[PDB]
Amino acid sequence: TLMIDMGLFMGRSFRVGWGPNWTLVHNGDKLSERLNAEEDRDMDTIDYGFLPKPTSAKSLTESPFKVHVEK
Amino acid sequence: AELLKTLAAFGKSPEIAASLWQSLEYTQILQTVRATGLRQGVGIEVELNEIESRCEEYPLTRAFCQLISTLVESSFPTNLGAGLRAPGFEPY
Amino acid sequence: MADKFAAKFVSHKISRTRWRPVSASSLQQPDVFATGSWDNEENKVCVWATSDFGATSLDEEYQGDPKQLCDIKHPGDVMDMQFLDKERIVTGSSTGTVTIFRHHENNQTLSVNQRWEQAHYHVGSNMRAPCTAIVCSSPEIVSVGEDGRINCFRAESRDVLRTIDDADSSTMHGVTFLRTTEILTVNSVGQLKLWDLRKQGNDPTQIFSVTGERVPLHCVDRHPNQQHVVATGGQDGMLCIWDVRHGKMPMSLLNAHEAEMWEVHFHPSNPDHLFTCSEDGSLWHWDASADSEKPTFLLGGRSTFNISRSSIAPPNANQSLACAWLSTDPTKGQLEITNLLPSSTLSVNSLDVLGQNLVCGTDAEAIYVTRRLFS
């Protein structure tokens, strides 16, 4: 998303979850952990896609459906 | 193909037919929305190109024909897309 | 007979064949050649090798063989794929993406160099579109598409160098060089359109349609006996021939058929023979003149129903003969197209002729080749 409507005295924010001894329950990524779209690419590459399934017109569908946990 | 003909035999129930219709539109097994984010342009088209041609026997094609036949005759369009799906059977 | 074909059951569908180039000028068959998929197993580009010429090749099945070398898989069909130079490859994607490789013949691989991810597209629906025609004269690159944009690029760039947009554009069928930097197309309206590479603007640079049954013209090419005279084929079945570099005029309106000319291509060793391929269900070799009195490549082929090889020559003593070209009034007759069907064939989607040599890949799941086009 793009926060571009910065007013003042704003709302609230969020945190990923801890896991035992520096395990991490994470919807986001650390170095290179999450993938872009399309199942087919020139250089023999396949990737994910979930978000545009329900819509024939995107509204920056940014909602998590798998949170990975890494140590 | 066996799965497909089973679903065809299931659709004989009209509300089951409607459930199949809406479920399949959600799934987009074959090619409905051409917005990228996937490997589109796939399905029976491909396997028809390769294998059925070599066999000289082409049963899946006819089975899926009967699939849409039953789908339309039992279930009728309630919706096909409003910026949410691709409206219209025109693709297939 | 006409030098029967070698047929290799490749178990594969073919869309695009294009010679691996070495530029400059030489006669050999490029043994190496890159292939764009109709649907082989996926859509892919493969590298393939052909034992050139009847010399040193009468083997490896019967009369040679092309052989798979490697391949890399490609989103969007390879409708068109032309080579900038010896090993730089440019193909259009049905995903509307312009894809450029550098091939590695020794490593037997293809390098994913340059992508214009952005191409021709539909308005009012926000949907992507493939490219109708790519134009490669090294290193300048032109792209034209269904929606009618113009895509002008210098080699080696992943962003649009220029896309000419218009208050007037249309569907485009076939393109050809008129000169080094002059270009023509035949359109889906019965429209003959002209541009110069250096000078363009809003709405088509030049637009033409005239009496003579304007039909959607699908294929255009510049003659193997001269470029600035070109030939076009469309719905009506009549071939239209023109001389330009800024102005059109008909050499001929040949009543060569009754129905759409989908694609036409030109004989090198014979600057006056032609070929046509059509997914109407047939594929013809086109020959000068008509009548079975000359070797018939009007009904030649088809397994049976074969006819060809008839001849007679006046000694010019008390004998006179005249033919159609000697008439300049338009609306000439048929000019000898023969459809060929060996035992059964499906949609042939790519073909090539070099000298009297011919290759062609198809949807008939095989390849057909001949050393000689005649006998």
Short mmCIF file of N, CA, C and O in Angstrom, two decimals, chain C residues 300-367:
data_model
loop_
_atom_site.label_atom_id
_atom_site.label_comp_id
_atom_site.label_asym_id
_atom_site.label_seq_id
_atom_site.Cartn_x
_atom_site.Cartn_y
_atom_site.Cartn_z
N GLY C 300 -1.75 -30.16 -58.39
CA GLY C 300 -0.68 -31.01 -57.94
C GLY C 300 -0.85 -31.35 -56.47
O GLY C 300 -1.46 -30.64 -55.68
N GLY C 301 -0.29 -32.50 -56.11
CA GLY C 301 -0.46 -32.99 -54.76
C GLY C 301 -1.83 -33.58 -54.55
O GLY C 301 -2.53 -33.97 -55.50
N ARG C 302 -2.24 -33.65 -53.28
CA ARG C 302 -3.47 -34.24 -52.77
C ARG C 302 -3.39 -35.77 -52.78
O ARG C 302 -4.44 -36.41 -52.83
N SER C 303 -2.19 -36.36 -52.80
CA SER C 303 -1.97 -37.80 -52.76
C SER C 303 -2.40 -38.41 -54.09
O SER C 303 -1.56 -38.79 -54.91
N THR C 304 -3.70 -38.50 -54.30
CA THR C 304 -4.27 -38.77 -55.61
C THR C 304 -4.73 -37.46 -56.24
O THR C 304 -4.47 -36.37 -55.72
N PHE C 305 -5.41 -37.57 -57.38
CA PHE C 305 -5.86 -36.41 -58.13
C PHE C 305 -4.64 -35.59 -58.54
O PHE C 305 -4.71 -34.35 -58.62
N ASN C 306 -3.53 -36.26 -58.80
CA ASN C 306 -2.29 -35.57 -59.13
C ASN C 306 -2.22 -35.28 -60.62
O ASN C 306 -2.56 -36.13 -61.46
N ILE C 307 -1.77 -34.08 -60.96
CA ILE C 307 -1.51 -33.71 -62.34
C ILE C 307 -0.44 -32.63 -62.37
O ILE C 307 -0.46 -31.70 -61.56
N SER C 308 0.51 -32.78 -63.29
CA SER C 308 1.60 -31.84 -63.50
C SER C 308 2.41 -32.30 -64.70
O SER C 308 2.04 -33.27 -65.37
N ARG C 309 3.50 -31.58 -64.97
CA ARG C 309 4.49 -31.99 -65.97
C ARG C 309 3.90 -32.17 -67.36
O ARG C 309 3.90 -33.28 -67.91
N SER C 310 3.38 -31.09 -67.95
CA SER C 310 3.02 -31.05 -69.35
C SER C 310 3.69 -29.84 -69.98
O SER C 310 3.80 -28.78 -69.36
N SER C 311 4.16 -30.00 -71.22
CA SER C 311 4.94 -28.94 -71.85
C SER C 311 4.82 -28.99 -73.37
O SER C 311 4.58 -30.04 -73.97
N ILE C 312 5.01 -27.81 -73.98
CA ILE C 312 5.05 -27.64 -75.43
C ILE C 312 5.65 -26.26 -75.71
O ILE C 312 5.36 -25.30 -75.00
N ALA C 313 6.49 -26.17 -76.75
CA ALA C 313 7.23 -24.95 -77.02
C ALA C 313 7.21 -24.59 -78.50
O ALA C 313 7.59 -25.43 -79.34
N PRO C 314 6.78 -23.39 -78.88
CA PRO C 314 6.82 -23.00 -80.29
C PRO C 314 8.24 -22.67 -80.71
O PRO C 314 9.01 -22.08 -79.94
N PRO C 315 8.63 -23.03 -81.94
CA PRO C 315 9.97 -22.67 -82.42
C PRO C 315 10.08 -21.26 -82.96
O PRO C 315 11.16 -20.88 -83.44
N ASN C 316 9.00 -20.47 -82.92
CA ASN C 316 8.97 -19.11 -83.45
C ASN C 316 9.38 -19.08 -84.92
O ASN C 316 10.31 -18.36 -85.29
N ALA C 317 8.70 -19.85 -85.76
CA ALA C 317 8.91 -19.75 -87.20
C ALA C 317 7.63 -19.27 -87.87
O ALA C 317 7.62 -18.21 -88.52
N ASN C 318 6.55 -20.02 -87.70
CA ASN C 318 5.21 -19.66 -88.15
C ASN C 318 4.22 -19.81 -87.01
O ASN C 318 3.00 -19.92 -87.21
N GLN C 319 4.73 -19.83 -85.78
CA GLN C 319 3.92 -20.10 -84.60
C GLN C 319 3.91 -18.88 -83.68
O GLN C 319 4.94 -18.23 -83.49
N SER C 320 2.74 -18.58 -83.12
CA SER C 320 2.56 -17.43 -82.25
C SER C 320 1.88 -17.85 -80.95
O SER C 320 1.05 -18.77 -80.93
N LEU C 321 2.23 -17.17 -79.86
CA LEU C 321 1.66 -17.45 -78.54
C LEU C 321 1.63 -16.16 -77.72
O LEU C 321 2.54 -15.33 -77.79
N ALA C 322 0.57 -16.01 -76.92
CA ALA C 322 0.42 -14.84 -76.06
C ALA C 322 -0.09 -15.28 -74.70
O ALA C 322 -0.71 -16.34 -74.56
N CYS C 323 0.16 -14.45 -73.69
CA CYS C 323 -0.18 -14.79 -72.32
C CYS C 323 -0.75 -13.57 -71.60
O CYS C 323 -0.90 -12.49 -72.18
N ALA C 324 -1.06 -13.77 -70.32
CA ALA C 324 -1.84 -12.79 -69.58
C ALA C 324 -1.04 -11.54 -69.21
O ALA C 324 -1.56 -10.43 -69.31
N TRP C 325 0.23 -11.71 -68.80
CA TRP C 325 1.02 -10.55 -68.38
C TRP C 325 1.07 -9.48 -69.46
O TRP C 325 1.17 -8.29 -69.15
N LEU C 326 0.99 -9.89 -70.72
CA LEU C 326 1.03 -8.98 -71.85
C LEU C 326 -0.22 -8.12 -71.95
O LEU C 326 -0.31 -7.27 -72.84
N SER C 327 -1.19 -8.34 -71.07
CA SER C 327 -2.34 -7.46 -70.92
C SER C 327 -2.17 -6.62 -69.67
O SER C 327 -1.77 -7.13 -68.62
N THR C 328 -2.46 -5.33 -69.78
CA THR C 328 -2.34 -4.41 -68.66
C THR C 328 -3.68 -4.04 -68.05
O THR C 328 -3.70 -3.47 -66.95
N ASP C 329 -4.78 -4.32 -68.72
CA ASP C 329 -6.09 -4.08 -68.14
C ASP C 329 -6.27 -4.99 -66.93
O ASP C 329 -5.89 -6.16 -66.99
N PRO C 330 -6.81 -4.49 -65.82
CA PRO C 330 -6.84 -5.28 -64.59
C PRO C 330 -7.78 -6.47 -64.67
O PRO C 330 -8.33 -6.78 -65.73
N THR C 331 -7.94 -7.15 -63.53
CA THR C 331 -8.82 -8.30 -63.37
C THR C 331 -8.36 -9.47 -64.25
O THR C 331 -9.08 -9.89 -65.16
N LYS C 332 -7.16 -9.98 -63.99
CA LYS C 332 -6.62 -11.14 -64.68
C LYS C 332 -7.23 -12.40 -64.09
O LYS C 332 -7.97 -12.34 -63.11
N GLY C 333 -6.91 -13.55 -64.68
CA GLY C 333 -7.46 -14.83 -64.26
C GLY C 333 -6.73 -15.48 -63.10
O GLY C 333 -5.94 -14.85 -62.39
N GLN C 334 -7.06 -16.75 -62.87
CA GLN C 334 -6.33 -17.62 -61.95
C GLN C 334 -4.88 -17.82 -62.41
O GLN C 334 -4.58 -17.77 -63.61
N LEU C 335 -3.98 -18.05 -61.45
CA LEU C 335 -2.56 -18.27 -61.73
C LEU C 335 -2.00 -19.45 -60.92
O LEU C 335 -1.06 -19.30 -60.14
N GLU C 336 -2.62 -20.63 -61.06
CA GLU C 336 -2.00 -21.90 -60.69
C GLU C 336 -1.61 -22.10 -59.23
O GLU C 336 -0.41 -22.19 -58.92
N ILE C 337 -2.58 -22.18 -58.32
CA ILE C 337 -2.33 -22.59 -56.94
C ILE C 337 -2.76 -24.04 -56.79
O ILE C 337 -3.86 -24.42 -57.23
N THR C 338 -1.91 -24.86 -56.19
CA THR C 338 -2.24 -26.25 -55.92
C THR C 338 -2.24 -26.50 -54.42
O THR C 338 -1.29 -26.13 -53.73
N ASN C 339 -3.32 -27.11 -53.94
CA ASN C 339 -3.40 -27.54 -52.55
C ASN C 339 -2.88 -28.97 -52.45
O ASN C 339 -3.14 -29.79 -53.33
N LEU C 340 -2.14 -29.25 -51.38
CA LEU C 340 -1.47 -30.53 -51.23
C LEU C 340 -1.84 -31.14 -49.88
O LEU C 340 -1.83 -30.45 -48.86
N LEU C 341 -2.15 -32.44 -49.90
CA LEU C 341 -2.55 -33.17 -48.71
C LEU C 341 -1.97 -34.58 -48.83
O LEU C 341 -2.50 -35.39 -49.62
N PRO C 342 -0.90 -34.90 -48.09
CA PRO C 342 -0.20 -36.17 -48.33
C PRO C 342 -1.02 -37.41 -48.02
O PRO C 342 -1.25 -38.25 -48.90
N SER C 343 -1.45 -37.55 -46.77
CA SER C 343 -2.48 -38.51 -46.41
C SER C 343 -3.49 -37.81 -45.51
O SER C 343 -4.69 -38.11 -45.55
N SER C 344 -2.99 -36.89 -44.69
CA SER C 344 -3.79 -36.02 -43.84
C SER C 344 -2.87 -34.98 -43.21
O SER C 344 -1.77 -35.31 -42.77
N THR C 345 -3.30 -33.72 -43.17
CA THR C 345 -2.52 -32.67 -42.53
C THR C 345 -3.43 -31.70 -41.80
O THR C 345 -4.57 -31.47 -42.21
N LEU C 346 -2.92 -31.16 -40.70
CA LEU C 346 -3.60 -30.16 -39.90
C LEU C 346 -2.99 -28.79 -40.17
O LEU C 346 -2.17 -28.62 -41.07
N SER C 347 -3.40 -27.80 -39.38
CA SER C 347 -3.08 -26.41 -39.69
C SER C 347 -1.58 -26.17 -39.69
O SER C 347 -0.93 -26.17 -38.64
N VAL C 348 -1.02 -25.96 -40.88
CA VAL C 348 0.39 -25.65 -41.03
C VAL C 348 0.55 -24.18 -40.65
O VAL C 348 0.00 -23.29 -41.30
N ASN C 349 1.31 -23.92 -39.59
CA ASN C 349 1.37 -22.56 -39.08
C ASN C 349 2.70 -21.89 -39.34
O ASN C 349 2.83 -20.68 -39.10
N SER C 350 3.69 -22.62 -39.84
CA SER C 350 4.96 -22.01 -40.19
C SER C 350 5.60 -22.77 -41.34
O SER C 350 5.57 -24.00 -41.39
N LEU C 351 6.18 -22.02 -42.27
CA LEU C 351 6.81 -22.57 -43.45
C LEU C 351 7.96 -21.66 -43.86
O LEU C 351 7.98 -20.47 -43.53
N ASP C 352 8.92 -22.23 -44.57
CA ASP C 352 10.07 -21.48 -45.05
C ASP C 352 10.57 -22.10 -46.35
O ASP C 352 10.54 -23.32 -46.52
N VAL C 353 11.01 -21.24 -47.26
CA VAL C 353 11.57 -21.66 -48.53
C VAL C 353 12.89 -20.94 -48.76
O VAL C 353 12.98 -19.71 -48.61
N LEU C 354 13.92 -21.71 -49.07
CA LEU C 354 15.25 -21.17 -49.33
C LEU C 354 15.77 -21.88 -50.57
O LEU C 354 15.94 -23.11 -50.55
N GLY C 355 16.01 -21.12 -51.62
CA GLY C 355 16.23 -21.73 -52.92
C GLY C 355 15.01 -22.51 -53.34
O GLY C 355 13.88 -22.05 -53.17
N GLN C 356 15.24 -23.70 -53.88
CA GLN C 356 14.17 -24.65 -54.17
C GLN C 356 13.95 -25.60 -53.01
O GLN C 356 13.29 -26.63 -53.16
N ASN C 357 14.49 -25.27 -51.84
CA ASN C 357 14.35 -26.06 -50.63
C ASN C 357 13.19 -25.51 -49.82
O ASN C 357 12.95 -24.30 -49.80
N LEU C 358 12.48 -26.40 -49.13
CA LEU C 358 11.33 -25.99 -48.33
C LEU C 358 11.26 -26.80 -47.04
O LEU C 358 11.45 -28.02 -47.05
N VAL C 359 10.95 -26.10 -45.96
CA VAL C 359 10.63 -26.69 -44.67
C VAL C 359 9.27 -26.16 -44.26
O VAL C 359 8.86 -25.08 -44.70
N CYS C 360 8.55 -26.93 -43.45
CA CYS C 360 7.31 -26.42 -42.90
C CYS C 360 6.90 -27.28 -41.71
O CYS C 360 6.87 -28.51 -41.79
N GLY C 361 6.57 -26.59 -40.62
CA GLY C 361 6.01 -27.23 -39.45
C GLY C 361 4.55 -26.86 -39.32
O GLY C 361 4.11 -25.82 -39.81
N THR C 362 3.79 -27.72 -38.65
CA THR C 362 2.34 -27.69 -38.74
C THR C 362 1.68 -28.05 -37.43
O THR C 362 2.32 -28.31 -36.41
N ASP C 363 0.35 -28.04 -37.47
CA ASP C 363 -0.47 -28.67 -36.45
C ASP C 363 -0.74 -30.13 -36.76
O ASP C 363 -1.34 -30.82 -35.94
N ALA C 364 -0.30 -30.61 -37.92
CA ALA C 364 -0.34 -32.03 -38.24
C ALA C 364 0.70 -32.82 -37.48
O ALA C 364 0.97 -33.97 -37.84
N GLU C 365 1.32 -32.22 -36.47
CA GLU C 365 2.10 -32.93 -35.46
C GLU C 365 3.41 -33.47 -36.05
O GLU C 365 4.02 -34.38 -35.50
N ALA C 366 3.84 -32.88 -37.17
CA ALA C 366 4.98 -33.36 -37.95
C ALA C 366 5.62 -32.21 -38.71
O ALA C 366 5.19 -31.06 -38.58
N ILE C 367 6.65 -32.52 -39.49
CA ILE C 367 7.34 -31.54 -40.33
C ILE C 367 7.44 -32.11 -41.74
O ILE C 367 7.61 -33.32 -41.93
#
